[PDB]
Ligand binder design. Sequence first.
Ligand SMILES: COc1cc2ncnc(Nc3ccc(F)c(Cl)c3)c2cc1OCCCN1CCOCC1
Lengths: 271, 124
Amino acid sequence: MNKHSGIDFKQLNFLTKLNENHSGELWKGRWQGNDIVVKVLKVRDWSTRKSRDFNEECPRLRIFSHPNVLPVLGACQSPPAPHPTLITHWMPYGSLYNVLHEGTNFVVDQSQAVKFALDMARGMAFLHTLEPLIPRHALNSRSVMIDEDMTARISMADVKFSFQSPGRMYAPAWVAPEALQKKPEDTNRQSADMWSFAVLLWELVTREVPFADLSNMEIGMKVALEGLRPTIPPGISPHVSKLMKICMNEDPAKRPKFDMIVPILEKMQDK
Amino acid sequence: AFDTLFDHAPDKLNVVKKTLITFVNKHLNKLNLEVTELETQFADGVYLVLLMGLLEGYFVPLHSFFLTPDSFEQKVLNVSFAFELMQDGGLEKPKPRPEDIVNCDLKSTLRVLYNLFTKYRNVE
Ligand SMILES: COc1cc2ncnc(Nc3ccc(F)c(Cl)c3)c2cc1OCCCN1CCOCC1
């Protein structure tokens, strides 16, 4: 009599392991005629409470109504599955991070980069129309995926669930200074996400990983407490400089909403 | 294991202490922090939290612990949180109580640091 049974773990065809780390394992596989990625989550002290929470939080991620949002196709409830598990469609180009920084075959041009920015801004504007907000999605280049036609899509499978440790931040270079220091309840989420978007703009402009020479702990402590900021690159157009600066305003309240920068990025298109 | 390294080799205790001093400074110096005394400088839990993030590759949001603890209880909470990060990283539950670190029990302090050293010797 549950509203959802989730995806049957027994119907997953696991083909090849892609990664393993602190958060779990990623596999390429197949399910009901789909090429998929499976994330098997690693959770210490799994409990019925956490399992209930996982099963309430996953349905919110099944967003099929926007081209720049990649849904979770479904999730395997644990029990009966061996571990809590997420499934999404396989995105052939991988993450935006992969395409920008690990791309061995080609370098995406700046017209494509501007389209990526527009894609991401449209997806985030849509996400911020949802009520309530999807808890705990950190926007960065690893949590945006590039689909078969080069469309950028916000990855809903990369949200942080309630039982995943809030005390460990693995991509602080994209996080707003106030979000390094204050609880999410005390921060305006869309303004914090706009800072992340500004860092994505910086990444698209420089084709460098922000603060690549520093550990995550160095980044978080220096951005939060010592005013460390990305250096605005030389020789970029005044319009791109101006957009980056307004999106990275030190005052969260002065940062634009995503729906206000979508038309700006639309006019920047050249394709 | 840590009974002999502590008790019946007083000059060898100093060897381990100098080794641990070197290891924690390898990492904490990256935040412009220096440790000269293991007897007190980990008692308030702050450097343990910062050390775990340096060793395991994450930032710890400042709302998750007390960066400037103002009570014994906040220091205990910092040490307890650092112990949780320790278990998150694969180490088994630390033997000392949180209070043992806050009270500058050198054996409790040295055991926790040595276990971090045994695991993370080669992290750069
Ligand atoms: C084309 O490759 C991917 C497509 C992907 N498509 C969709 N989602 C992915 N990741 C993901 C991330 C979190 C999740 F919960 C789930 Cl279910 C999936 C994907 C991860 C992908 O690659 C993951 C590992 C990529 N690295 C890149 C180089 O180093 C080793 C492999």
